[PDB]
Design a protein around this ligand. Sequence first.
Ligand SMILES: COc1ccc(S(=O)(=O)N(CC(C)C)C[C@@H](O)[C@H](Cc2ccccc2)NC(=O)O[C@@H]2C[C@@H]3CO[C@@H]4O[C@H]2C[C@H]34)cc1
Ligand SMILES: [Cl-]
Ligand SMILES: [Cl-]
Ligand code: NA
Lengths: 99, 99
Amino acid sequence: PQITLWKRPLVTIKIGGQLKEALLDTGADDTVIEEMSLPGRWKPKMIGGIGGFIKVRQYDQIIIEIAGHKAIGTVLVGPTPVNIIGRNLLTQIGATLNF
Amino acid sequence: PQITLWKRPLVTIKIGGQLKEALLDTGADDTVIEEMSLPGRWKPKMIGGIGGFIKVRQYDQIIIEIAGHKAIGTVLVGPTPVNIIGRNLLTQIGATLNF
Ligand SMILES: COc1ccc(S(=O)(=O)N(CC(C)C)C[C@@H](O)[C@H](Cc2ccccc2)NC(=O)O[C@@H]2C[C@@H]3CO[C@@H]4O[C@H]2C[C@H]34)cc1
Ligand SMILES: [Cl-]
Ligand SMILES: [Cl-]
Ligand code: NA
C-alpha cells in the first residue's frame, strides 16, 4: 500500500498468535511493544526516547506479521506508550518513504 | 525521492534562517526541534513519548524548507534529543510510506 500521513499510520500486527495495533515509525530504529509474553531468552537494552532512557527486554528472531507481511526479527518489550514498528522491521516488509 | 530505511531518514531543513539535520518521522504527530529562537507568539505544551514528557514552546505558522520542499505549520521547540519532522509537515511535502 501507499500510506498517507494525515492520520497516524496504524496497522494490525500479529505476534504470539495475538492481534495488536502498532504505529509504523520511521523515526524508530527498533520495534518496541508493550508488556507481553515472548518465548526464549532476553538481553538487556537501554533506549532513549523523547522523554529520556527506559529499560526494555530484547528478544531476537521473533515471528511477527505486520499489515499481513511476515517478518522475523528483534522485538523490544517494555513501557512504551504505543506499540511502534521501527526500521529493523520496516526494512523487512520493504517499506520506503516517498515524496 | 525514494528513501530506504536501512539508516535513519535524515534530511537537511531550513528553519528560522538556520540549517539543521532532522529525522523524517512517521511516528511523530508533531514536529519537534532542539532549542532555537523563532519569531512570533508561542504557548507552552507538554509532549510525551518513550521516557515520558518534555515541556516545549509551540509556535504556529512557521515556514520550514524540508529537503528543498517548503511547508508551513506548527513547530514545537524544546529539549528533544533529535530534531523530528512529524506528520503535520510530512503531509505538506506529500510524503507517503510505501510497501
Ligand atoms: C506530539 O508530537 C510528538 C512528536 C514526537 C514524539 S516521540 O519522539 O516521542 N515519538 C512518538 C512515538 C509514538 C514514540 C516519535 C518516535 O519516532 C521517536 C523519535 C525519537 C528518536 C530518537 C530519540 C528521541 C525520539 N522514536 C523513538 O522513540 O524510537 C525509540 C527510541 C530509541 C531510538 O531508536 C530506537 O527506536 C525506539 C527505541 C530506540 C512524541 C510526540
Ligand atoms: Cl500544523
Ligand atoms: Cl495527499
Ligand atoms: Na506564529
